Amino acid sequence: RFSPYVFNGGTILAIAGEDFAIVASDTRLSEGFSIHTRDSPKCYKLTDKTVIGCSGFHGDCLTLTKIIEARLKMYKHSNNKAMTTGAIAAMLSTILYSRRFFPYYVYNIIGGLDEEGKGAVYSFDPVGSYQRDSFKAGGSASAMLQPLLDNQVGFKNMQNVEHVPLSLDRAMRLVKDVFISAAERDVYTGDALRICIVTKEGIREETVSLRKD
Amino acid sequence: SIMSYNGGAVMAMKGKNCVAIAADRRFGIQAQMVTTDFQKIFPMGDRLYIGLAGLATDVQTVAQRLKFRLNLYELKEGRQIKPYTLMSMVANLLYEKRFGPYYTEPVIAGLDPKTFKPFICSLDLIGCPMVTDDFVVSGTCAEQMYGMCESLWEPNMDPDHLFETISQAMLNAVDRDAVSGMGVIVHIIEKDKITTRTLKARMD
Amino acid sequence: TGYDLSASTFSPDGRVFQVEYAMKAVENSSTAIGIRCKDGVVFGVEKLVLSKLYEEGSNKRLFNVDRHVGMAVAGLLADARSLADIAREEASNFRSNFGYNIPLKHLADRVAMYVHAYTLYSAVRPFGCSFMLGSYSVNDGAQLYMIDPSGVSYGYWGCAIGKARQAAKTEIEKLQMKEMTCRDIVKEVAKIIYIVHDEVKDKAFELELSWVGELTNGRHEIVPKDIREEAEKYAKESLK
Amino acid sequence: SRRYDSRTTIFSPEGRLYQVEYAMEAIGHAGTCLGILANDGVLLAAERRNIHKLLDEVFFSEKIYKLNEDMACSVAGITSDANVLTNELRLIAQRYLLQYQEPIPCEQLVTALCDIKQAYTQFGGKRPFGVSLLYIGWDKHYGFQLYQSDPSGNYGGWKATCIGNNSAAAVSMLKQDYKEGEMTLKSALALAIKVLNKTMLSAEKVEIATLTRENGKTVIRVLKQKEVEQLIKKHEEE
Amino acid sequence: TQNPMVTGTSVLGVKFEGGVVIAADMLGSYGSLARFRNISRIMRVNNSTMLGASGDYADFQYLKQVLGQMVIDEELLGDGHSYSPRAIHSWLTRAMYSRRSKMNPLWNTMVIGGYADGESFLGYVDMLGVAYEAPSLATGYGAYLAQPLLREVLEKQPVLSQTEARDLVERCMRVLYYRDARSYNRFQIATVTEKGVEIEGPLSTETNWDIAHM
Amino acid sequence: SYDRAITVFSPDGHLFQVEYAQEAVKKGSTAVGVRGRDIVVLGVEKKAKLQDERTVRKICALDDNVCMAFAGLTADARIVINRARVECQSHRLTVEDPVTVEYITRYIASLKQRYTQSNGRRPFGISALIVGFDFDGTPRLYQTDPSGTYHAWKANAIGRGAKSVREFLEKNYTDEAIETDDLTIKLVIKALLEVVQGGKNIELAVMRRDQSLKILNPEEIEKYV
Amino acid sequence: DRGVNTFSPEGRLFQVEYAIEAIKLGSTAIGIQTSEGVCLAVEKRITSPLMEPSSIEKIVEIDAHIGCAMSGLIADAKTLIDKARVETQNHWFTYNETMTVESVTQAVSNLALQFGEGAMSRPFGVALLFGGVDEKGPQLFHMDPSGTFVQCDARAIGSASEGAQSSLQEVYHKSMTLKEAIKSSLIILKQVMEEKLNATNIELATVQPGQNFHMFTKEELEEVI
Amino acid sequence: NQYDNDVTVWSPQGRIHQIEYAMEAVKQGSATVGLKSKTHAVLVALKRAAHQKKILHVDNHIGISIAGLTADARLLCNFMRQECLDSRFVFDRPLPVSRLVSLIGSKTQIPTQRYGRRPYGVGLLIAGYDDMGPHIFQTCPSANYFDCRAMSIGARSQSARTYLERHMSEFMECNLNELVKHGLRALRETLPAEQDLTTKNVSIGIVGKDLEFTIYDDDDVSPFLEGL
Amino acid sequence: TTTLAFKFRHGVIVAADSRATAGAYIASQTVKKVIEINPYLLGTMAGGAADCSFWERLLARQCRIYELRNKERISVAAASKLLANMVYQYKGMGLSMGTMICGWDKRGPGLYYVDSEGNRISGATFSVGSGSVYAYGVMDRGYSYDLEVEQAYDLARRAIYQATYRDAYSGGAVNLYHVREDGWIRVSSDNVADLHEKYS
Numbered sequence A: 001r002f003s004p005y006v007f008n009g010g011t012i013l014a015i016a017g018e019d020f021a022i023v024a025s026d027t028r029l030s031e032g033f034s035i036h037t038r039d040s041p042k043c044y045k046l047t048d049k050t051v052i053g054c055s056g057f058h059g060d061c062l063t064l065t066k067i068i069e070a071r072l073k074m075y076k077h078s079n080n081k082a083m084t085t086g087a088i089a090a091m092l093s094t095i096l097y098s099r100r101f102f103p104y105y106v107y108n109i110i111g112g113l114d115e116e117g118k119g120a121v122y123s124f125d126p127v128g129s130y131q132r133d134s135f136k137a138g139g140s141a142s143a144m145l146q147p148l149l150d151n152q153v154g155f156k157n158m159q160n161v162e163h164v165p166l167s168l169d170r171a172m173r174l175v176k177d178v179f180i181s182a183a184e185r186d187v188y189t190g191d192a193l194r195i196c197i198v199t200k201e202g203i204r205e206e207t208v209s210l211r212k213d
Numbered sequence B: 001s002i003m004s005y006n007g008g009a010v011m012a013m014k015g016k017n018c019v020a021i022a023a024d025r026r027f028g029i030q031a032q033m034v035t036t037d038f039q040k041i042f043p044m045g046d047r048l049y050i051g052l053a054g055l056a057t058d059v060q061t062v063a064q065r066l067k068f069r070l071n072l073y074e075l076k077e078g079r080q081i082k083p084y085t086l087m088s089m090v091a092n093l094l095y096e097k098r099f100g101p102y103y104t105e106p107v108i109a110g111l112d113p114k115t116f117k118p119f120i121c122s123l124d125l126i127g128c129p130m131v132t133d134d135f136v137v138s139g140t141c142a143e144q145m146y147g148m149c150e151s152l153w154e155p156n157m158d159p160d161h162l163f164e165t166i167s168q169a170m171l172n173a174v175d176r177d178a179v180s181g182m183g184v185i186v187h188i189i190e191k192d193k194i195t196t197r198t199l200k201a202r203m204d
Numbered sequence C: 001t002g003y004d005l006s007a008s009t010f011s012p013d014g015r016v017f018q019v020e021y022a023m024k025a026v027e028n029s030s031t032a033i034g035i036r037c038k039d040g041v042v043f044g045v046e047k048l049v050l051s052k053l054y055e056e057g058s059n060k061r062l063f064n065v066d067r068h069v070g071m072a073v074a075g076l077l078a079d080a081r082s083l084a085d086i087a088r089e090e091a092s093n094f095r096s097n098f099g100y101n102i103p104l105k106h107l108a109d110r111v112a113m114y115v116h117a118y119t120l121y122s123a124v125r126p127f128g129c130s131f132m133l134g135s136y137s138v139n140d141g142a143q144l145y146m147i148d149p150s151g152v153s154y155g156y157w158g159c160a161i162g163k164a165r166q167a168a169k170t171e172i173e174k175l176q177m178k179e180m181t182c183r184d185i186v187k188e189v190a191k192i193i194y195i196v197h198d199e200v201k202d203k204a205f206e207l208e209l210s211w212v213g214e215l216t217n218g219r220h221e222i223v224p225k226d227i228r229e230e231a232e233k234y235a236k237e238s239l240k
Numbered sequence D: 001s002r003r004y005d006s007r008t009t010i011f012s013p014e015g016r017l018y019q020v021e022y023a024m025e026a027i028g029h030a031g032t033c034l035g036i037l038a039n040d041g042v043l044l045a046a047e048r049r050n051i052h053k054l055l056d057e058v059f060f061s062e063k064i065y066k067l068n069e070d071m072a073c074s075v076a077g078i079t080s081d082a083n084v085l086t087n088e089l090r091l092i093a094q095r096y097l098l099q100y101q102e103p104i105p106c107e108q109l110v111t112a113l114c115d116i117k118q119a120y121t122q123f124g125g126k127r128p129f130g131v132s133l134l135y136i137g138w139d140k141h142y143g144f145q146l147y148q149s150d151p152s153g154n155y156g157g158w159k160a161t162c163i164g165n166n167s168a169a170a171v172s173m174l175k176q177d178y179k180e181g182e183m184t185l186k187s188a189l190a191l192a193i194k195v196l197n198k199t200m201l202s203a204e205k206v207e208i209a210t211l212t213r214e215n216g217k218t219v220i221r222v223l224k225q226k227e228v229e230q231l232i233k234k235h236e237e238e
Numbered sequence E: 001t002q003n004p005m006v007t008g009t010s011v012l013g014v015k016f017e018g019g020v021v022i023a024a025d026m027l028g029s030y031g032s033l034a035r036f037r038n039i040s041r042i043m044r045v046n047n048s049t050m051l052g053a054s055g056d057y058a059d060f061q062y063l064k065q066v067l068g069q070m071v072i073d074e075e076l077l078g079d080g081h082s083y084s085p086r087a088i089h090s091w092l093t094r095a096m097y098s099r100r101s102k103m104n105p106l107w108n109t110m111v112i113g114g115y116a117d118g119e120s121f122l123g124y125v126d127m128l129g130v131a132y133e134a135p136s137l138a139t140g141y142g143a144y145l146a147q148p149l150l151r152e153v154l155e156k157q158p159v160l161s162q163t164e165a166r167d168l169v170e171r172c173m174r175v176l177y178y179r180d181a182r183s184y185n186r187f188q189i190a191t192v193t194e195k196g197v198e199i200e201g202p203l204s205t206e207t208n209w210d211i212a213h214m
Numbered sequence F: 001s002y003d004r005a006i007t008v009f010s011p012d013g014h015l016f017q018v019e020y021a022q023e024a025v026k027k028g029s030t031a032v033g034v035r036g037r038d039i040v041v042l043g044v045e046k047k048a049k050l051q052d053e054r055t056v057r058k059i060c061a062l063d064d065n066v067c068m069a070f071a072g073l074t075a076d077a078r079i080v081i082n083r084a085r086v087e088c089q090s091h092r093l094t095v096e097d098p099v100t101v102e103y104i105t106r107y108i109a110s111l112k113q114r115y116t117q118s119n120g121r122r123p124f125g126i127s128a129l130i131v132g133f134d135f136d137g138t139p140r141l142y143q144t145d146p147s148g149t150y151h152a153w154k155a156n157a158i159g160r161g162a163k164s165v166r167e168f169l170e171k172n173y174t175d176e177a178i179e180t181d182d183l184t185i186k187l188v189i190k191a192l193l194e195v196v197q198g199g200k201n202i203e204l205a206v207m208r209r210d211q212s213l214k215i216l217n218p219e220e221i222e223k224y225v
Numbered sequence G: 001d002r003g004v005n006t007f008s009p010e011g012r013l014f015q016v017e018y019a020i021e022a023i024k025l026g027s028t029a030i031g032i033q034t035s036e037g038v039c040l041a042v043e044k045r046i047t048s049p050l051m052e053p054s055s056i057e058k059i060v061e062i063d064a065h066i067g068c069a070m071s072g073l074i075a076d077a078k079t080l081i082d083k084a085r086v087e088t089q090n091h092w093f094t095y096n097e098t099m100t101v102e103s104v105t106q107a108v109s110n111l112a113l114q115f116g117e118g119a120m121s122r123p124f125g126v127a128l129l130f131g132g133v134d135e136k137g138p139q140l141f142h143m144d145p146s147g148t149f150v151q152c153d154a155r156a157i158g159s160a161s162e163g164a165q166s167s168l169q170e171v172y173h174k175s176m177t178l179k180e181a182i183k184s185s186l187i188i189l190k191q192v193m194e195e196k197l198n199a200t201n202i203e204l205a206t207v208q209p210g211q212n213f214h215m216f217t218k219e220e221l222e223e224v225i
Numbered sequence H: 001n002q003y004d005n006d007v008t009v010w011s012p013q014g015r016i017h018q019i020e021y022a023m024e025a026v027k028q029g030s031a032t033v034g035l036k037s038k039t040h041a042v043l044v045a046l047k048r049a050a051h052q053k054k055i056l057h058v059d060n061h062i063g064i065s066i067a068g069l070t071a072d073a074r075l076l077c078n079f080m081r082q083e084c085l086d087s088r089f090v091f092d093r094p095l096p097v098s099r100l101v102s103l104i105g106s107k108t109q110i111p112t113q114r115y116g117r118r119p120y121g122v123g124l125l126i127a128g129y130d131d132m133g134p135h136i137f138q139t140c141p142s143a144n145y146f147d148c149r150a151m152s153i154g155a156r157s158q159s160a161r162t163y164l165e166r167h168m169s170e171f172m173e174c175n176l177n178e179l180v181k182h183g184l185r186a187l188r189e190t191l192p193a194e195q196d197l198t199t200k201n202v203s204i205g206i207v208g209k210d211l212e213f214t215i216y217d218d219d220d221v222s223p224f225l226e227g228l
Numbered sequence I: 001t002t003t004l005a006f007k008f009r010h011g012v013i014v015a016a017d018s019r020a021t022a023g024a025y026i027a028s029q030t031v032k033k034v035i036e037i038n039p040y041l042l043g044t045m046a047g048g049a050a051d052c053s054f055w056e057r058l059l060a061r062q063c064r065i066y067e068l069r070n071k072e073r074i075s076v077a078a079a080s081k082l083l084a085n086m087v088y089q090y091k092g093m094g095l096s097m098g099t100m101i102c103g104w105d106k107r108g109p110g111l112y113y114v115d116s117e118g119n120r121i122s123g124a125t126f127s128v129g130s131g132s133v134y135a136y137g138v139m140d141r142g143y144s145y146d147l148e149v150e151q152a153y154d155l156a157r158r159a160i161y162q163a164t165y166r167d168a169y170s171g172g173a174v175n176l177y178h179v180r181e182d183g184w185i186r187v188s189s190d191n192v193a194d195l196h197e198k199y200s
């Protein structure tokens, strides 16, 4: 009996700032107890101000990103402008739902800037249920990442703390930390961490080394 | 068993220059009786009848769809259908549904509309025809009916003897079937008349 | 009133004028020739320069329809290009089904029957193009076929299509092509094109040359530029 | 091809449908056919256009068709077209009986066929059927009924009407002689002979069918040659 | 394919300075039976691209037919454009994903090796449309037995010469012969460089069985 | 199937087949509609002896709350009427409300319009007057024609001599004329008597607020004449 | 004799030529684009006092931010209006944003030329003015039966468009306010109309950056006159 | 007369009148010019209310200029866009320009041979850049296509073609600025003697070695006109 | 999930929790389960999140088209019927939807329950979701047609709160809406942790 799905691992994370958005992923591609490659990013640039993270079944990740890239150009041709972060999120909802009865085995997070230049994060289930988030972890180690973010970014369960705005510097340190911690416990997360920072200036990337085991 | 869902029994029997056809009257759904006057024998001409046992919905559908085709045939050809031709027409209707069949196994009883020669047959649910010179049975108590018919039937029975034989065969057969009975109707077809009787029967 | 509007209409004398009118479109085109020699087939085309703005190589009239099959065309070029696609698809399908390279004769027959299908109906019009198919292999040797708008297909030692067809044939008949190599033939093809070229009426032309033979290992290829230029110079000096 | 298309389903500049009108011309050259409603039944009277000596007469009728248990019809126009339409009428009647398990009311049968005829005048680019039909019948809604349909798919109910040859002359005679609400079958028969006498007399040249009710059941019968020869003799006395 | 029939085992690949080398044994297994012992599981696609296939051999022959015709089609045009290794890999990904999505997979795992624009290409495509690039690849049991040795060498020395990559591949083929019960001691090696695609074979490995006295 | 373009543009921007369809309407019997205060009235001219009057009627109910009159090809009319009847039921099914008079008008009009722009078909050769009441009890009268144009009217006429009847209604349609139910019916009869030269050859029907269509007897029409 | 997809020796599609002529049978519509918004004004052209003026709808809402004035064969326009309405809602559904005036015009014009040999047998005999507000500000577009569309500062369509366009080019300036534009188009409509302009025989609608598509009420029209 | 209504009817002289009539449609369009150097391909167009669009984006490496029926132009532009998307989807690389033009010719030929169909009444100038460098192609209602050093189509384009022939020997070696000015000068030849190129009537499209196909309109064309 | 709605004198109250789960994992505590179909119509999300969001967004699309075509706002009965007809075609294909369509039309306050099983029923009060049984208890004990506006708010808020207490799959915040004659309003959003402080 042929199965059309396999789990390929990967952890994705996005954080929305005042004037920035971060999308981060590990670079490991796995199957079973094996590693396919140590250099497989899960982040894809869509426009100058929008990045998408995708994890799950790698077959579906590849297909979906190629579909999105095509749809962006189609939209630009008929509407004479680039798609907004919000429009991409809305569109992806319909793309995912078009396969409601044979789903894309994919967890998606969109990170970028809204129309006011503010950070925007959108998270999706495999059939296109979605909402805007302040921050979100997806994929293999998401149950490991999410609680610390709730605590450190959301200030959950903390008394007598001033709810300061989140600086890029603190956000960058949090991203590195959660991934290093995930790399300790989740067998699927490791090798390297790829961080994409989206600001008005553009998208810049940073890479940090993770455990190779 | 799909054929036992509604229950039911029909038989036909050949006499000298006459035929008979009989049916139980129960309409039930598994154990539950619903009505006691369900029609299972339908006229297909002055001297030609079809009786259908099996799934009640299919009994009705086949009766109605066969009448459709027979009415068109009679209008086109300007004559009454011969019994053997009706059997073929029925066989054709049933076999069209070879891969999703009607759950009914009919019996035909009649006289040839010109020779008045007796004819009886039965068909399976996919329309394999079977012509006999004695009797045919169809329903959930086929074995009980075979036992009575084999024991009681004689050749060249007069209308009165034929009536008693098919009556006793049906009554005593259905009384050994939980899902058949609640009454018996009998039609005697002769050259000059049809005689229709309901029998005094157990109502359990 | 007229008997010449539809390919599904015979005239009282049993002609199909729409096919004849399509053949006229070929007769108005400039000349292409094919010559079958000892060890292959050579094609040459008088390609008229309609504008100096066009690139050298624009509106090719020589096509590869399979790795071993070349095609030379005359007539309405859009129709010719679509026939090149038909031929390509036919060669492709043959390999898929039968598992070897299509014999030239079979390809000619198949494409010709496609051409013919367009001569029967009011729903479609005949192709306004004639073409030559050329091939070489060790087993089959050199083969040259020509198909016209009616769908007729024959094999030739030498062939010409276009407006100077009769004048080209006269020159071709002077050759003992059976005994000659492709190297010699390219020069003769260049020569014949320069002879039949009406210099007064049509002003500027490019010579287009291709070949398939033992020297190309049964692959249809353009004649190398250096050999083409040598042939042009030979043809020019011969016309003295 | 637009060249060869005769465009059978278009309007003329006056808003006329030429093929329909030419079809009605065809019918006017067909055998005379009339129907008469009475209190105790309906009848059809037709001129036989098959009056050759070497004909066999193999059917019970030539121009009168049974449609179902409660209905018959007669036709004027192209015979072959009539065969198509009468077959279709039988199918519609049976389709209704299958669905409702009751006979189709007469007007419902007429409407259903007229919808087919109308379709041929509006789309499909085909020639219409060159047939007018007279329908006789009984139903539980309106009892004894007589209908007429023409090639466009128009129909109407009549107490008496005529189609085919000399139908204008026949409709005149009917207006004069037809006693509305007082007609029996015997007097309707008489009037039918009288009308066919003028518009056309022999028993071989006419065909008469009657529709009556007996014991809650419809009887459709084609009169035998003896009954028709006796009706012809009864008129000539008048 | 719902059910693979005749199948091939591991395919290996490694990038080196100026090209790529792939290897596959010449066996088609029918279950446990070594049935067809002289079949090629490597394909020259064009002058810059080669392809090796694990899994169903009938499905491989189909891809050879389709892809072979595709390259012929392109060469007919003679327009100076040619399918890059990356383009073949992309096409293959789409084809495999497409067949998977119809619940009618081509039952193959494939290694594409190429050299174009002074760049080595090595890509993986499986029957589900999972595709990626890596400095070394190994399908099947090769993933467990060969890939650890390949990645071990590439860790200490990322850039290999052609002879070093060839020695490393021969060592891995020896390991697979020792430890994979569907392998065979008869293999081909294909190399792509600036000069084009060469296919060498049949090749054999020398074996050591000293441990039989231990 | 047959795909010939039947309705096409001519020089000057004319759609000849539609104009010819409109000629078919003018050959039709006169039909008059008047919208009153709390009543809507339709009246039609009739063409005979020996004919059954019931069978050949030019006033037809589409739903319980909507009815229409027509002029032109009677066969085409039957097709449009039955299409509208189906649509009235589809609406009750999907929205659980009866159709508005405007909704069904819009449907009939768009059907007619489609037959002016579809291959292999000629236009419908009828105009229709559509009457009834809305949910809020507002009386309505609409007209459709072969082109698929529709408009609401206080009063209107279609068919033979529609132009004369229209000019009569323009001078006669006042508050005094539609003040009662009796005067509303009268105005329709007067409008018809202007072109029917008759009074015994007219069919008339009335529709009141949520009371369904009532066709008047010949004895009741003889009282007004 | 000749097909619907025939070219003239001058390289024009006959049917499209004839469809453009049919626009000249239509009543006059005017659109003006200002920095404060866009206004649309149309002559109703009442043909009878018995006809209800409010049942003549020549300005329609496409979405909250887009209106549409039409001229020509009005029945043809209904199918185009529906396509525009559906398309704006399709865009909202997919992208969760408003569709630009240009994009809507583009989508509608895709229908044109899609005729030939029960598909469309002929072009649509209508011209459209699309007026709305998006992120590019207020915008007016014109589309004709050929499927050509273009942005316009001020445009007139219909029978008296040539004269009205002359008037527009004289009065229009880029810094002109919306209140001026409303008055301008009403003055121009007044002079090109056959009947005397009043509050019942014209339609007027605006779309502003501030507020949604607004159809002027009877009382609002009286104020402007 | 009887030979000029159907695209399936050959005339006795071996011509198809419907195709020729379709070619007249492009002559009625406004002038457009295309030319190339060794690094760039440029489109320049005169625009005939806002001025009507003439230059359309197809892919990052391909743009087109149109002359003739606007509706046919968009139908063909959509086909072209789709072919480019398909190529990138399947092969993850741009569709070679010459391959796209072949696809256009094959597509536009089909209706020239089938009854009740008509030719595309549009001519295209196609500017592209691929592995074989910059390209200018021209497509015709006849479904024929041409590989051009430079070209002009539309009304009074004959005088633009005359300019181009005169100057084409220096096109290959021009930088981008000089190449655009050459295109503007050629287009200016089409204008009546009094009329001039303005920022309202000129549209420019450029694709090259390190530049995605970009369209310049209105204020964006000012830098190019200033140098003239 | 716990959602409820009830008609009363002053319109229809709609309330929901905000928790979404993937198995036992809490994926979100800030889901908007009250869906704004149009300014006069609300829907609710229970069952499959994508299924409700997609199909009700499709309803919003159809309702807007209807308004444009008919020049009148759609009734609650007709809107709920549209949705029921939409999903019926997909019975047995594994759609998971339980929704309440809430509005105010010509018939006054309107409230329909519609699900993917094919149910469509009008009613005075409904509760839908894993937590519905717990909300029914509280709502049924407190509900009256002649309830005051502030009393209606308190009851809806409390009923959802009590559901979040007992039902593992309900929690986060309680979101409350009020459908009035001139449209709906967002009344409040209270974190369950804040409500705990208040109620004890």
Ligand SMILES: *[C@@H]1CC(=O)N(CC)C1=O
Pocket: H023, H024, H026, H027, H122, H123, H139, H140, H141, H142, H153
């Ligand atoms: C070649 C094809 C085309 O469109 N033209 C312009 C009329 C040509 O000269």
Ligand SMILES: [Cl-]
Pocket: B065, B068
């Ligand atoms: Cl049947």
Ligand SMILES: [Cl-]
Pocket: C026, C027, C130, C160, C161, C162, C163, C165
């Ligand atoms: Cl020739």
Ligand SMILES: [Cl-]
Pocket: B071, D068, D069, D070, D097
């Ligand atoms: Cl019957």
Ligand SMILES: [Cl-]
Pocket: D068, D069, D070, D093, D097, D102, D103, D104
């Ligand atoms: Cl019957």
Ligand SMILES: [Cl-]
Pocket: E035, E036, E037, E038, E039
């Ligand atoms: Cl072997």
Ligand SMILES: [Cl-]
Pocket: E042, E043, E044
């Ligand atoms: Cl090979």
Ligand SMILES: [Cl-]
Pocket: F111, F114
């Ligand atoms: Cl329709």
Ligand SMILES: [Cl-]
Pocket: F025, F026, F071, F127, F157, F158, F159, F160, F162
């Ligand atoms: Cl009229």
Ligand SMILES: [Cl-]
Pocket: G023, G024, G127, G156, G157, G158, G159, G161
């Ligand atoms: Cl105009």
Ligand SMILES: [Cl-]
Pocket: G113, G146, G147, G148, H069, H070, H071, H072
């Ligand atoms: Cl156009």
Ligand SMILES: [Cl-]
Pocket: H140, H142, H144
């Ligand atoms: Cl050309």
Ligand SMILES: [Cl-]
Pocket: H026, H027, H152, H153, H154, H155, H157
């Ligand atoms: Cl030109």
Ligand SMILES: [Cl-]
Pocket: I018, I029, I030, I031, I032, I173, I175, I189
């Ligand atoms: Cl929330």
Ligand SMILES: [Cl-]
Pocket: I062, I065, I066, I069
């Ligand atoms: Cl709707």
Ligand SMILES: [Cl-]
Pocket: I120, I121, I122, I123
């Ligand atoms: Cl209910």
